[PDB]
Sequence to fold (478 residues):
Amino acid sequence: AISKNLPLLNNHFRKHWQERVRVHFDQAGKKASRRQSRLRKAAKIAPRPIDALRPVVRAPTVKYNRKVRAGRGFTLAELKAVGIAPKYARTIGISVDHRR
Amino acid sequence: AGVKTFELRTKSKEQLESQLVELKQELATLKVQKLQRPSLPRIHTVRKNIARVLTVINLNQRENVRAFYAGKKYIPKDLRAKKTRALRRKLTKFEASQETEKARKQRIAFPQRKFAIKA
Amino acid sequence: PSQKSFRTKQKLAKAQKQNRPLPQWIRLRTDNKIRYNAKRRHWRRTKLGI
Amino acid sequence: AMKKVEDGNTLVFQVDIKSNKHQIKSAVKELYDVDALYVNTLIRPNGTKKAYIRLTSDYDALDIANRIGYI
Amino acid sequence: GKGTPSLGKRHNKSHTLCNRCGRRSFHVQKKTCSSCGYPAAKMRSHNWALKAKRRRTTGTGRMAYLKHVTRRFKNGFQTGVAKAQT
Amino acid sequence: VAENAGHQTSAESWGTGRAVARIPRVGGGGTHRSGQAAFGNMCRGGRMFAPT
RNA sequence: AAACUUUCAACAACGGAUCUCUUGGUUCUCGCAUCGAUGAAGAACGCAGCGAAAUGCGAUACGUAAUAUGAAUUGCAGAUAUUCGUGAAUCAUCGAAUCUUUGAACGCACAUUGCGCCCUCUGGUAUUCCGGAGGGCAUGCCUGUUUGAGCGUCGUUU
RNA sequence: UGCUGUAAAGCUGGGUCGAACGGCCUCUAGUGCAGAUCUUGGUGGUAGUAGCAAAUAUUCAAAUGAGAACUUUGAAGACUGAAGUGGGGAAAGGUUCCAUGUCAACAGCAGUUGGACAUGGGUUAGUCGAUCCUAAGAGAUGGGGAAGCUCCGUUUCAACGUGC
RNA sequence: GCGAGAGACCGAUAGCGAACAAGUACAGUGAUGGAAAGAUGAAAAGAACUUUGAAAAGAGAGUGAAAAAGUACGUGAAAUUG
RNA sequence: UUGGGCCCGGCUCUUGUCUAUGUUCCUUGGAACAGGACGUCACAGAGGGUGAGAAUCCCGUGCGAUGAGAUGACCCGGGUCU
Ligand SMILES: [Zn+2]
Fold:
C-alpha cells in the first residue's frame, strides 16, 4: 500500500465517480453554436450594439488594488452628473447599478 | 372504384340512408354467394362503399352542428380544439397580454430606443 | 372444464385459430423468409397458462 | 345445418356475438319478413355465434332458404 | 413425499387473468395483480427491475394516439381543412 | 461500448460441489440460456475485459 | 498371408471454422419540446377474395374522408375498376372522421361478457310490465344558481 | 511442390474458389492460447454395449395393404369380477371429440393404426348450473393516522332515502 | 422522446438480450427469467421428360458461367468417419 | 418623451418543383460497371443502384432559382384607419 520514496497522494476516487464523468466533446460544437447565437442576436438589433456600456471599477482586495476592470453599471450619482435618468439610461445602451 | 364521394356530398339526408340500406343488402346478398364461390373479390368493393356513405353522412351531420354552435360561448367538446391537454390549459393571447396599468405607463414612458454609435 | 367463464372460452377460441399451418401461397411472395409457422402448439406438449 | 331447414323447419344463421334472442327475433322480421317460433343461440368454439331459428308453421323454412339463396 | 407425490396435488390456481394487463398474475385471494398492481391507480413499476420496464412501456404496444403527436406538432396543431389548389 | 453490455443478466454462481466451473450462471429454466455462464470476459455474451 | 489396429495421401462424409459481405448495433455531435377525463400509455378480442405471425387498423376494422401526385398491384384470382383523367396505387401528405371490450376508467360490480336507475322515441291491447334504439347517472375541489338547516344572530308583533 | 530464416515466420508449385487484397515508412489497439473442474458449438471411444423383464395370455383364419407378431372382422382362449380395467361427474386440460385422407417426424420394436399429421364438421335451455343470499372473511364511504406509497375502521363522534 | 449528421467503433460466439414473425419461442404459481436463428444464383432459370421403385428417392436428361451453387444451398477448416 | 387595430414584406421553420457531361470503338467475360484508345463535364471526382472497381446509364451531388404553407402582444421595414 505504501512502498517507495514517493509523494503521498490525495486521489479522491472512492465514490461512484464514473457515473459523473463529464467529457466536453462538444467544445467545438458549443463554440460554433455560441458564435451562431451571437451572430443572430447581433443581426436582430442592427445597428444597435449588442453590448451595453459598462463602467470601470477597482478590483477589491489588497492583491488586486492595482488592477482596474469593467464594472456592472454606472451609479445613480454618475448618471446624475451627466443628466441621464437610470430608467432612460437603461434604454440607450447604458447599464445601471443601483447598488454601487 | 365504387361510389364517388363528390356525388354523395350532393345527396340529401333522405337519399344517403336510402343508398346505405341498398349497399347493406348488396353485402348481405354477396355473403350468401361467398359460401359457394368461394372466392368473391366484389366483397371488398361494397364494404368500402358502405364506409364512404357512412363517412359522408357523418361529415354532413357534424357540419350542421358546427354551424349551429358558431359563436356560442360553450360548444360541444368534440367540436373544440384538440391541440393537447397542456395547450388547452395555457393562457390565451388576451390573458397573457394583460398588464397592470402601472406596467403600461412605464412601458410607454421608456420604450426601447433605436440608436447607433461612432457618429 | 365444461363449466367455464366467457373470458376463458374466448381465449381458447383464439388459441385454436392461431394453431394452423402456414398457407401455401405465402411462400411464393417475393423476398419471403417465412417457411413455416414457428408458433405451433400442441395441447399435450405446451400448456396455454390461462 | 341444411338438414334442419327440411326436418325441423329451422333456419341456421351466423349472428353477431353481442346480440340476444330478442334482437335476433326482430332482425329476421325486417330482413326476411318471417316469424320465429323460437331462437336458440350458440357460441361456437371458434368464437362466433350461431342461431337456430325455428319458424312458425305459417312459413316454410325450405322456401325462405331458397329465397335467401343458399339451398 | 415432497417431490413427485406432492406435485400431483396442483389443481387450484393462485393467479387468474388480470384485466388491466391480461398476464395471469391476478392473485385471486388478494384481489391484486402481482405484475401491474391492479387495482391500484398507479402501475406497478420499480427501478430495481429495469428489464421489467422494457417489457411493458410506451412503444411496446400500438401508440394509437402517440404515433401522430409529432406529425401534428410539425404542422403546429392545424385546425380546418386543406385547400385545393386551383 | 454500452455501460450495461454483458451485465443485463441476474446470473449467480452455482458454487462448488456441482462439478462445474465457478463462473456465474443463468438461472431459471425452459430456455437453452438457462444454466449457461455469464458476466465473464471468457464467456459468450459476457462483457469484454476493460470495456472502452 | 488375410482380418484387425495405427499413420498418411486422394476422394466422399460430419460439422460450420475461415474469408468476404451487412436495411443491425454502439459511441459522439447538432437541432427540437409535442402524452392524458376533448379519455392517454397499456391489455384483450377481432378485421383481408384466398393469412398463421409480424405490420396496420377497429364492426366505416391490412381501413373512410381530404390535399398532393399521376398508371399501377402482383403469389394467384378479380371487377357491375381505372388511362389526353375529379383518375390506378400510395401510413406520399394529412387539418375531417370512425375508433369493439377495457384500461387513470367514471352508474354499482367484476374469478360474472352480472345488476340497476333516469330522459326521449318505438313494439307488445300499457305512466306502473316486458323488448328495442339513442342519450345519461364516478370522486375531491373551485366560482356561481336554487332549495334549505341552526333561539348562531339582527329588526317587528303578541 | 519446394525455398529462405537459429526462430517467431515469410515466399512459392498443384488443386479448390469467386471479389477483393498486399509490400514498404509511420500511427493505433478489444493484437498472438494447450490448459483456467475456462465459455459456446460440434464430434468420439465406451458401443451396436447397458438395456427395452411389475400389472396371469394369447392363438387360427380372412380382409386391406408394396409390406401384417402389432390394423379391421370372425372364431376361440382369457382377465378386470359391481370398493371393476364398468357407467358418470368436481378440479385441471382445451379441440384431445366426429368423419375423410394420410405416415416426413412422434407412439424408446413395428405400423396400413393413433390422443400424431392435414382438411372440414360439431356443443341449441323460462325449468340443469352460474346469475341471487349470506358464512368464515374481504373491502369502499364519513372520518382519523401517515413525508408518502397507504394504514385503521365497517356504521364507525356523519345532516348518510339515487326512500316508498 | 422526436429529427438529423458522423466515427482510426463491432462485423453474426462480435455489436444492444434482439442485423431474422425478439422481449419472440420457452420456463416459473408469481415476482421475474429469457434464447437460438443472416448469405443459392444476375435471374428460379427451383430440375420439363424417360426409366427403376409402394413411395421417398436413384439413374439418365435439362437449367445455369458454375449443380465442385439443388433450398439438408457462397467458401466448406478440424475433431470424427467411409 | 408618447396609443391601438389591420395590409403587405423581410427574418425563422416546414414543404413542392426545376438543372452538366460517353453508355463511342476493340479485348476478356454469362453479364463491362474490368483493361486499352479517344473524348466530355466539373461551384457536380460525396453516396447509392444497375448482371464485377461507373464523375460522364439512373437517382442524387454542386449551384442556385421559384411556389405553397405556417409562426412571432412580447422582431422591424413600409403602408392604411383611428
Ligand atoms: Zn395486471
In short: Residues E 18, 20-21, 23, 25, 33, 35-36, 38 surround zinc ion (CB under 6 Å). The helical segments of chain A are 27-44, 76-81, 86-89.
